[PDB]
Ligand binder design. Structure first.
Ligand SMILES: Nc1nc2c(ncn2[C@@H]2O[C@H](COP(=O)(O)OP(=O)(O)OP(=O)(O)O)[C@@H](O)[C@H]2O)c(=O)[nH]1
Ligand SMILES: Nc1ncnc2c1ncn2[C@@H]1O[C@H](CSCC[C@H](N)C(=O)O)[C@@H](O)[C@H]1O
Ligand SMILES: [Mg+2]
Ligand SMILES: [Mg+2]
Ligand SMILES: [Mg+2]
Ligand SMILES: [Mg+2]
Ligand SMILES: [Mg+2]
Ligand SMILES: [Mg+2]
Ligand SMILES: [Mg+2]
Ligand SMILES: [Mg+2]
Ligand SMILES: [Mg+2]
Ligand SMILES: [Mg+2]
Ligand SMILES: [Mg+2]
Ligand SMILES: [Mg+2]
Ligand SMILES: [Mg+2]
Ligand SMILES: [Mg+2]
Ligand SMILES: [Mg+2]
Ligand SMILES: [Mg+2]
Ligand SMILES: [Zn+2]
Lengths: 38, 115, 337, 189, 102
RNA sequence: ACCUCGAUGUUGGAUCAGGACAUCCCGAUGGUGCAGCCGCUAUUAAAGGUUCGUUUGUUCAACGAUUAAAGUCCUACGUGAUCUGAGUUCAGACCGGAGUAAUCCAGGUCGGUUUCUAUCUACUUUCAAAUUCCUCCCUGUACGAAAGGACAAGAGAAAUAAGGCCUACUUCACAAAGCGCCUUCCCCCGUAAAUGAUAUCAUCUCAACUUAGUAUUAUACCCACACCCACCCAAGAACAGGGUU
RNA sequence: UCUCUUACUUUUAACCAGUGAAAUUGACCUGCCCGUGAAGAGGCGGGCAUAACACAGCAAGACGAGAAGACCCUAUGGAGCU
């Protein structure tokens, strides 16, 4: 997970969610794409 | 207890230990969390313009009851490897050295007397 | 914990050659301040010196196995700048670059280090000397502020880190001669083997065990072609490993109508790379003898190449033992003393 | 300018004794970072700044690396204990000899008075052994020594080979410090 | 001699050959080891030439031929106080009245 | 900037610390150009810990030996009615230099007086629910061409910290002490998962909800109350406390 | 001296009896945290705490007490020396 203020897409497989009251980006093909809202 | 700046006696047949010199060998360092060194502990020596590792073998300070207590601070010169530089130990070594944790077997091997 | 299955194109990860510009730590430093006190208001000059730059050393690590980890540009840690109260700057810590076992360092046309051993080190760049302070320069004559200069930035050196895989024996042959297959046979190593040509782009080392607790390393490189001096095919770039290899295995497929011409092409191309490689001692090994056409052409191989050439199958593992005998004998011959 | 404050120690010794003269060959040992080499070259005019004055030669040998200097050549890394390095000193020095010996070399201080003393004195013994082929007859010898037991021993052998042994403790050297310099002029034998 | 029942010395060809033997012996030991029989530790893996393993009532020394020539462990243990190496070394005594003279 | 601090100056050091996290080490995660071993980067965590010498008045720094690590700060650059006075500071003297001189110097060097009987505030047994290193087993296994080399689970040894004790050893001797002996117990709030809508697929949910996750607590210690003759005491400044069949 | 402090004696000390000072003192029925006062609160603001009363210790605060004031500046103030 990388802390980013603004969240982007790196893939089509890449998807957003709102968990624990913050935005995240999850990615099954490339787990390196993961992002956490700060 | 052998700590920093303590005079020790090299009880070996090693050339370095038995060589005539103006200085008695001194304890540079003790390899223990607290500075005090009892028997079996490793300590660093300044002899004859060089640093050498050594194993404590008997000391003047009283220990556990049935364990022997010597009248001089006896050390054996060892390499960093663990190989003793000398071949023979004339002076008796305590038997307790056997059960203690570490590389003691080689030194036991070259010793003649157990007390 | 499992190792990830590798793609054929693993040359993406594995790097043999790299141009590095190494620069040591800068001097930093520089203080031009003045001390003051309650009773003594003027006090005097008060400049601490700065710490020296950290050196750059190419320490050899066994567990890197590639020059992929090294970067294009390295900069050593600079020493802290001098402060007031005549406080000195701390010298930068030493920067270490981990480099493979078979590495070689070349600066300006000539080799500077061959770090072919374990634990051996070479100083890539000297860290620059830390500059002087205001307290320096104080004399009976002065009482004056000069901060000198930051002084001596780290040494800029451009060098080529070049990896030559270290083995006792290497393999040379045309594509689809079954080099990878043969390696897979004799060693526990698993090189990628396939019918399509120009496989095993990355050099592959497997070792062979023996009864005397000694190990002989054999290397597998990609297929070579006649020419290769004009960078046709995969070129002769991969031939760099073979320089370190004590002897060669001339792997020749019998599928081709004239396999005797194969070794002629191989010796010619090796000469094109380096003169002594052709004169270097070797063993010639024939493969894929399970096929009837190989058995047919065997007679003419005996006519041309002679009895000394050892005939083998990789798939069925025919006459593998004679190879092992010959490997050991060549080792004992001219790999000793 | 001077790379270390050690250069100031030599200045104080020189002014008293006139150890360095123009057109006089100098060997510096433990030169790096080169404060002693920088101060020597000015006095001997090895850089050739003064046209009228004769030009000398300075060489420095140390384990650590040194930046190049005007009118001075360096050989590093080198150890004087190694006899191989001596031949390399021999070849570069003009006239097969070096007139001046400066020994400000000291093995890294361990923080034990006894151990540090023994190494530095024995290092000077090695210098004394290698004097005959390096040092020109009537040449000057200067070595840095820590104060201890075998300081007297080093004095005794110096008095054998040299006419006079001068014990110097410079003001530039910290007064509380135990470092002592032995000067030995008029080399014979 | 309050050390062991049986002392054993064995030589080796190479450093890695010594590790082979020592590690096999300890491995096989554990197989046949009694439950209450304490576990054992190999000594001197960092060392080049000398390896040692202590068992309950057996002590084994793995060496090169080089170290055998310099230690003479067999001689020490067969004949204790009578070996040649003990003869060369003599005990040092302080002078009477405790005065040294040059 | 300022009619705010300081007439027993200020730097360091001793002692004793309180706090912040922007975490040096130990704990929990995500990613990796993470085979394993080391590594690189980010989230979370301040309960605990964070070495000894030499040079220099050293704060710094360098050097040597270690460690698990030898963190970055703030607190009147914490603390001098708790202590030193080494440097820099008054009266003496010298070197070098300025000056006609008296005298001076951001330089170098030698010597040089640290007071206080505590009135008020505050405080003077709250709880330890203990941390870490190493060795062995697994195992020399997984993994790996080899070289190398794991994790959970478990065992033993130590070191310190806290709380005690005197049978031995030791300083000693109706006792008090360490150099000696005994005991020392809970988890972390970052993420990993299902089922399932808005948006009939999917989706870990600032949707309703379901497990790692208790997503908060221990347990333990104390706990009756004559005479207040006098004596004694492992209790104690006094007072009080225990015993006196 | 220190690692690393310990034990005992004397002095002091603390209690009973006799004698009996000094600096100091606007008045005080004299708390803690946060803010304000730019720095600096026992006394001002918002919270919190809180029956009364001796004796023994400690030195964090009372910008603690005591002095022929250390430093910088001023005076159409002095004085010594050249
Ligand atoms: N019949 C038979 N076929 C064989 C034998 N050995 C190899 N082969 C075939 O030949 C192929 C050789 O492929 P590689 O081993 O990759 O070839 P190479 O010699 O390493 O050369 P590159 O393709 O350039 O890497 C194998 O994939 C088999 O199909 C053999 O003993 N018998
Ligand atoms: N035998 C030897 N020969 C040469 N250099 C030596 C030596 N023994 C030690 N040294 C090196 O000498 C260095 C000190 S010499 C430096 C002196 C001073 N800084 C100058 O102005 O020159 C040490 O760092 C050490 O590494
Ligand atoms: Mg100032
Ligand atoms: Mg192939
Ligand atoms: Mg104004
Ligand atoms: Mg004021
Ligand atoms: Mg944080
Ligand atoms: Mg502040
Ligand atoms: Mg105070
Ligand atoms: Mg005096
Ligand atoms: Mg009193
Ligand atoms: Mg009274
Ligand atoms: Mg008074
Ligand atoms: Mg306030
Ligand atoms: Mg008030
Ligand atoms: Mg009171
Ligand atoms: Mg005044
Ligand atoms: Mg007037
Ligand atoms: Zn994706």
């Amino acid at each position: 997970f990388k802390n980013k203020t603004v969240l982007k897409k790196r893939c089509k497989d890449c998807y957003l969610v709102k968990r624990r009251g913050r935005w995240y980006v999850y990615c099954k093909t490339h787990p390196r794409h993961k992002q956490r809202q700060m | 207890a052998i700590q920093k700046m303590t005079r020790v006696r090299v009880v070996d047949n090693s050339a370095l230990g038995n060589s005539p010199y103006h200085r008695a060998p001194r304890c540079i360092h003790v390899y223990k969390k607290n500075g005090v060194g009892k028997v079996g502990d490793q300590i660093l020596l300044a002899i004859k313009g060089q640093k050498k590792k050594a194993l404590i073998v008997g000391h003047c300070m009283p220990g556990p009851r049935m364990t022997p207590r010597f009248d001089s601070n006896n050390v054996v010169l060892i390499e960093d490897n663990g190989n003793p530089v000398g071949t023979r130990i004339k002076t008796p070594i305590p038997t307790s050295l056997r059960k203690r944790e570490g590389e003691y077997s080689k030194v036991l091997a070259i010793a003649q007397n157990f007390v | 914990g499992k190792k990830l299955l590798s793609e054929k194109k693993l040359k993406r990860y594995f790097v043999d050659y790299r141009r590095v510009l190494v620069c040591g730590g800068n001097g930093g430093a520089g203080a031009s301040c003045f001390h003051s006190e309650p009773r003594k208001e003027f006090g005097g000059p008060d400049g601490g010196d700065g710490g020296n730059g950290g050196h750059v050393i190419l320490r050899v690590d066994q567990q890197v196995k590639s020059l992929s980890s090294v970067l294009s540009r390295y900069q050593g840690f600079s020493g802290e700048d001098g402060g007031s109260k005549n406080c000195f700057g701390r010298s930068g810590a030493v920067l270490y670059i981990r480099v493979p076992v078979g590495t070689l360092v070349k600066e300006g046309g000539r080799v500077v280090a061959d770090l072919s051993c374990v634990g051996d080190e070479y100083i890539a760049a000297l860290g620059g000397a830390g500059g002087k302070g205001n307290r320096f320069f104080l004399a009976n004559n002065n009482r004056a502020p000069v901060t000198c200069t930051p002084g001596q930035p780290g040494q800029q050196r451009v060098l080529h880190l070049e990896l030559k895989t270290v083995a006792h024996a290497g393999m040379v042959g045309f594509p689809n001669a079954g080099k990878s297959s043969l390696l897979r046979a004799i060693s526990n190593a698993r090189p990628a083997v396939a019918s399509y040509p120009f496989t095993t782009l990355k050099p592959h080392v497997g070792i062979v065990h023996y009864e005397g607790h000694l190990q002989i390393a054999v290397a597998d490189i990609p297929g070579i072609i006649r020419g290769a001096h004009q960078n046709r095919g995969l070129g002769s770039a991969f031939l760099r490993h073979i320089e370190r290899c004590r002897f060669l295995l001339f792997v020749v497929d019998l599928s081709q109508p004239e396999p005797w011409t194969q070794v002629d092409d191989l010796k010619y191309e090796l000469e094109m790379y380096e003169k002594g490689l052709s004169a270097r001692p070797h063993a010639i090994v024939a493969n894929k003898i399970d096929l009837p056409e190989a058995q047919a052409n065997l007679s003419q191989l005996r006519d041309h190449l002679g009895q000394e050439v050892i005939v083998l199958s990789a798939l069925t593992g025919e006459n593998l033992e004679q190879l092992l005998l010959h490997l050991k004998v060549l080792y004992d011959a001219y790999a000793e003393a | 300018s001077y790379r270390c404050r050690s250069a100031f120690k030599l200045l104080e010794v020189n002014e008293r004794h006139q150890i360095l003269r123009p057109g006089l060959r100098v060997l510096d040992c433990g030169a790096a970072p080169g404060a002693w080499s920088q101060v020597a070259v000015q006095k001997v005019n090895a850089a050739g700044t003064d046209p009228s004055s004769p030009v000398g030669f300075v060489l420095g040998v140390d384990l650590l690396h040194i930046f190049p200097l005007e009118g001075a050549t360096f050989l590093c890394p080198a150890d004087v204990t190694d006899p191989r390095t001596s031949q390399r000193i021999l070849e570069v020095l003009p006239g097969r000899r070096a007139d001046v010996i400066l020994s400000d070399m000291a093995p890294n201080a361990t923080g034990f008075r006894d151990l540090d003393h023994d190494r530095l004195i024995s290092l000077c013994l090695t210098l004394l052994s290698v004097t005959p082929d390096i040092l020109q007859p009537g040449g000057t010898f200067l070595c840095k020594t820590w104060a201890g037991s075998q300081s007297r021993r080093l004095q005794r052998r110096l008095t054998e080979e040299f006419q006079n042994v001068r014990i110097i403790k410079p003001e530039a050297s910290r007064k509380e410090s135990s470092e002592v310099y032995f000067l030995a002029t008029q080399y014979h034998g | 001699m309050r050390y062991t029942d049986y002392f054993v010395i064995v030589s080796g060809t190479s450093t890695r050959h010594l590790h082979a033997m020592a590690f096999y012996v300890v491995k096989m030991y554990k197989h046949l080891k009694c439950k209450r029989d304490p576990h054992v530790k190999i000594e001197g893996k960092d060392t080049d030439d000398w390896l040692c393993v202590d068992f309950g009532s057996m002590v084994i020394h793995l060496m090169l031929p080089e170290t055998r020539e310099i230690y003479e462990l067999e001689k020490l243990w067969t004949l204790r106080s009578y070996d040649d190496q003990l003869a060369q070394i003599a005990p040092e005594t302080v002078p009477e009245d405790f005065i040294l003279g040059i």
